[PDB]
Every structure is written in C-alpha cells, then in structure tokens.
Amino acid sequence: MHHHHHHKDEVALLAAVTLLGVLLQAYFSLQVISARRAFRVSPPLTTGPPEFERVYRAQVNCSEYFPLFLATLWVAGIFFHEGAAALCGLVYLFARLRYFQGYARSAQLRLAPLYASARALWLLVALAALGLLAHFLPAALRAALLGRLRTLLPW
Template identity: 45%
Template sequence: MSLIHTEDVLLLAIVTLIGGYQLVSFAKLTGAARRKFKIVYPAVTGNPDFERVYRAQQNTLEFFPIFLCTMWVAGVYFHQIAAAGAGLVYLYGRNKYFSGYTVSVEGRLPGFRLSGKTLYAMLGMSVVGLTHAVLMEYLNINLKVKLLHMYYNKKY
C-alpha cells in the first residue's frame, strides 16, 4: 500500500481549481444574459439567446462530476501529468463549447466533441491505471514490467 503525497496530486488540484473558476465564470455570464434578455427568476425560457447560454452552463455543470472523477482517477492511478494535461484540454473544450453555444446551437459541436473525446481519453487512462493497480495488489502481477520485458525481448 502506498501513501499519496501532495506533490502526487498537485497538478490535479490546480486543474480542479481552474475548472471551478470556469464554472463561476459561466455562472456570471449566465446571470448577465439573464439581465440582458430580461429573464426573471425562476424562469429559464423565454428567449432563445438566453436559453442557449443557460443550456451551455447547465450542460457544463452536468458533465463536471464526470470530468473530476475521470481526471482524478487517471491522475492517481495512471499518470498525474497526462491526466492534468487532458484535464486542461477538457476545460479548453468546454470553453469552446460554451462560447460556441452562445452564438448558435451548431456552434457548440466542436467544443463538445473535443471535451467528449478528452473524457474518453481520461476514462481509458483510468481503466489502464486501475487494472495495473488491481493486478499488482491482488495478483502480484506487474503489468508494466511484463510489457517492457516483452518489448525488449522481441527477436527482430
């Protein structure tokens, strides 16, 4: 059993805070759109331009727990730098998604695709990392060593 030290998750924590900042920024933009289009609380409909901003914010909130889970598991069990880098790409994609959606429904697609592909990448890193950890912990099989051994012992 190994202990996790703060330096082992430092980059993940930084990307998490950047993500939190992004959520706050999107909430402020949604509030500004609510004022601009005169949408009185608790209404969330009434103007298509406001509705696109609102949906962009809500969709980002809906995906945030998935983002956090996959990034942190990938960072702890696969590689912190790879997971944090993917997290930054995901947040960039969400920014493109938000800004594109505020212009048009179709404008959301490039950012949505980028962030979706990045979630799948972090999920893949998580599965590989967890598989390795389970094999090490319960079967004493070091997958990294076996793969390196297979690679370097190939006959050409």
C-alpha cells in the same frame, strides 16, 4: 495532524486543474446571470429568448459533466500518471470554454468543441481504467494461478 511527510506534491497539478475548472464553472454561472439581464429573464424560470436558452443550456450541460470530469481526472491522475491526467484535463476544460462560447452564438457552433471535450473526457476515462487494471489485474491473475496450482502434492 502532522505527519513528517505530505502527499500534496503528488496531486498539485490535479488540484490546479480542479481549481481552473471551478473558476470556469463560476464564469459560466456569471454569464448566465449576465444573459438574464441582457435578455430580460427573471428568477426562478429558465425560459426566455433563444439566445438566453442556449447560454442557460450550455451552463447546465457543463455543470452536469463537471463532477464526471473531476472524478475521472483524480482517478486517472492517481492511478495512471499525474501529468498526463492534468494535460487531458486542461484540454477538456478549454474544449468546454469553446463549447459554451460556441453554444451562446449558435447551437451548431457548440458541436466541434463538444466533440473535442468528449474525446478529452474519454481519454481520461481510458487512463483511469488502464491505471485501475494495472493495479488489480496482476494480484487477481496471481490468486487465480495459485488456486490452480493445486494440482500439487503430485506431479
């Protein structure tokens, strides 16, 4: 409720990549709705021609991974480096766009961009992990050394 400082400028690139991700997900959704018309599939019900089922499944898989992407983007961006996390996020999202486009054409064409999206997501995971390790490991190593010291009142 103010606050004479804000932390917006520390997360704005994460927020922009997040919004791009929302926009891409919305687009995937609109493509499924468009495929429902092209290939005559009525709600509820997610079975129909192969071409429809591939578009449907591409959207479902993107949707499933999307919170994982968001969680890791934010943890990596806060604990490791904002710019690095955001760049990796852009690469992931572009890879997901290529995955969806590929998959819609052929199951097999989903594979190369799928691998690219996994490499970008795993890099985000590794940056998040390194950032958290940097945060916790020094204090933990110190507390353990201190307990050891201890010895003491001797030597």
